[PDB]
């Protein structure tokens, strides 16, 4: 069960924690989406599909930085939707391909601020996902930890739109 980040980072078979650098829009108004769409940055695949067929879940989520200052949103995984970090465990998706396969995850965002300036701390850690992997042949239980790194400081629109 190998994997690779679109930036060239790769976690070998067995587990580990890796860093991904994702880009974000320079300006988000009142709740557009501020999505990450990690389905173009992480690609895991299976080793021996003849007998070993992998099953990939999102074990847990966590948020850090300016998201935990004033933000909210949802998370997508294979035609579903959950709130900010999943308090429950989402179901499994079968990885059974000896080929590249985008991981269908995202992170929707929306500002709960009323009057603020800078947001999403640049170069900081936006979120952490924990790819849990099981199989149909062994009790293999590891954690591909992925750490979302902010690439830019997202600026909330300035003051205005007020009445007496």
């Amino acid at each position, epitope marked *: 069960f190998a994997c690779k980040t679109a*930036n060239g980072t790769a976690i070998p078979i067995g587990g580990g924690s890796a860093n991904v650098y994702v*880009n*974000l829009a320079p300006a988000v108004n009142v709740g557009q989406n501020l999505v990450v769409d990690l389905s173009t940055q992480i690609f895991c695949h299976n080793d021996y599909p003849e007998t070993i067929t992998d099953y990939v879940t999102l074990q847990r989520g966590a948020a850090y930085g300016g998201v935990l200052s004033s933000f909210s949103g949802t998370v997508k995984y294979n035609g579903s939707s959950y709130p900010f970090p999943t308090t429950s465990e989402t179901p499994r998706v079968v990885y059974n391909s000896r080929t590249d396969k985008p991981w269908p995850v995202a992170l929707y965002l929306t500002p709960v601020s009323s009057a603020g300036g800078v947001a999403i701390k640049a170069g900081s850690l936006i979120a952490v996902l924990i790819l849990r992997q099981t199989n149909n042949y062994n009790s293999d239980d590891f954690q591909f930890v992925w750490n979302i790194y902010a690439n*830019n400081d997202v600026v909330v629109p300035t003051g205005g739109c007020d009445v007496s």
Partner: antibody
Amino acid sequence: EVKLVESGEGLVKPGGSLKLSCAASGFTFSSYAMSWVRQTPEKRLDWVAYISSGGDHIYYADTVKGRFTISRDNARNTLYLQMSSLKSEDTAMYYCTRDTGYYVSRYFDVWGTGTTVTVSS
Amino acid sequence: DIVMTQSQKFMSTSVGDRVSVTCKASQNVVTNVAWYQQKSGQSPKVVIYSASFRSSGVPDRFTGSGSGTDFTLTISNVQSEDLAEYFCHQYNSHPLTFGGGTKLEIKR
């Protein structure tokens, strides 16, 4: 005003190397990353290289990796694209631009004068 | 890579018209496509970053849109000096690659 001065042109035989020199003016260098992009003359643009504002994060595209190294000094205020192992024409219009690299989103905001690279016999 | 495909020709437009310039992604680029204006053998200038916001020094006659796989740049009114090559670019998947560029032609 912000300007990106450029120097260090020269024809190169295949298997050689050149040091492309680029300097800046009008801002604080340590807070902005830089990038190198080649504009083939009125033709296909290609992103050559990226370097962080500090110099710790350094990536190259598939067409230039294994042949290029880059560096910068914050105080000296001069980039250096030290490129070698020449192959496959490469004849472009190389150009240093201030891309707002990591800790900001990629823009390639301002460009300077640019230099030319020719690979012939 | 992610080929940022765009029309391999120019788009005819007389003065006073509206310019629409296409740019097509084979793979899913999330958002944040840049648009530059490059004249005859000169430096490209940052015009529309992230395909939705204007840059400083760029007039209000400029704008654009696009998401998913399809992006477009637009000129509300074409003055005499605006006509040049116009470049679309993606930077949400390494290696970040530019578009083919679009040539602006007057009809006379």
